[PDB]
Scaffold this active site. Structure first.
Site, PDB file in Angstrom:
ATOM      1  CB  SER A  26       0.289  48.800   4.791  1.00 29.52           C
ATOM      2  OG  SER A  26      -1.263  48.793   5.270  1.00 29.52           O
ATOM      3  CB  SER A 104       0.138  44.310   1.795  1.00 37.38           C
ATOM      4  OG  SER A 104      -0.005  44.687   3.394  1.00 37.38           O
ATOM      5  CD  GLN A 105      -4.688  48.627   5.726  1.00 41.22           C
ATOM      6  OE1 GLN A 105      -6.506  49.596   5.057  1.00 41.22           O
ATOM      7  NE2 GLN A 105      -4.148  49.159   5.465  1.00 41.22           N
ATOM      8  CG  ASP A 159       3.747  37.387   3.537  1.00 40.28           C
ATOM      9  OD1 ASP A 159       3.562  38.426   3.905  1.00 40.28           O
ATOM     10  OD2 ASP A 159       2.420  38.083   2.480  1.00 40.28           O
ATOM     11  CG  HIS A 172       4.090  41.607   2.578  1.00 46.35           C
ATOM     12  ND1 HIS A 172       2.571  40.517   2.567  1.00 46.35           N
ATOM     13  CD2 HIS A 172       3.624  43.048   2.897  1.00 46.35           C
ATOM     14  CE1 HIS A 172       2.166  41.404   2.457  1.00 46.35           C
ATOM     15  NE2 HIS A 172       2.207  42.735   2.980  1.00 46.35           N
TER      16      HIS A 172
END
Length: 197
Positions: A26, A104-105, A159, A172
């Site tokens: 992101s 992540s995303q 995380d 993260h």
């Protein structure tokens, strides 16, 4: 650097042997973000510049933070974009070995796309790496319809996204070392397992 469109720019007459499709996290820049370039450089060292095509997921994938909250952890438009890239790879270079990754995303996007992919194309992805996998708990550390032996998840202790939450904590943002070593190591190993050398 942060933008690579080797697949889109590539000549079908001279296809690379390995095609890597990667989705950024992101709010990250270009189509590779912070981790993509490190992985790319190491892949190039192993297969040579002409031997591997690096392709980030751009286009409709805006990597909007808010989309982490949607059902699949990303938008429908983003999934369509990544699916289209795998379809392009299959059309341009049917004999190449594919590998994928996401952070992540981007990890949720990679998982969703692979889950929806036509089996014949999905089966060509020799290995996939996911960092800070947002659907780690929900999917039990797996990518639906994809073998566990071809999957490697990097989820740091602390995380929170790996533990079912959407909170962003310091761990993260600590995947640098993994992207520099074990991640490309895994991808290279998986490619050589099927292509030999």
């Amino acid at each position: 650097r942060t933008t690579r469109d080797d697949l889109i720019n590539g000549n079908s007459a001279s296809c690379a042997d390995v095609i890597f499709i990667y989705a950024r996290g992101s709010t990250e820049t270009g189509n590779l973000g912070t981790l993509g370039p490190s992985i790319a450089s190491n892949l190039e060292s192993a297969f040579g510049k002409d031997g591997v095509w690096i392709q980030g997921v751009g286009g409709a994938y805006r990597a909007t933070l808010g989309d982490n909250a949607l059902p699949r952890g990303t938008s429908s438009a983003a999934i369509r974009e990544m699916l289209g890239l795998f379809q392009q790879a299959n059309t341009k270079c049917p004999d190449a070995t594919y590998i994928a990754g996401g952070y992540s995303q981007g990890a949720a996007l990679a998982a969703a796309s692979i889950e929806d992919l036509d089996s014949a194309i999905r089966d060509k992805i020799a290995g996939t790496v996911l960092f800070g996998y947002t659907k780690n708990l929900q999917n039990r550390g797996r990518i639906p319809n994809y073998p566990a032996d071809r999957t490697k998840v990097f989820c740091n202790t602390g995380d929170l996204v790996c533990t079912g939450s959407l909170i962003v904590a310091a761990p993260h943002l600590a995947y640098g070392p993994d992207a520099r070593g074990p991640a490309p190591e895994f991808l290279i190993e998986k490619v050589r397992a099927v292509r030999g050398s």
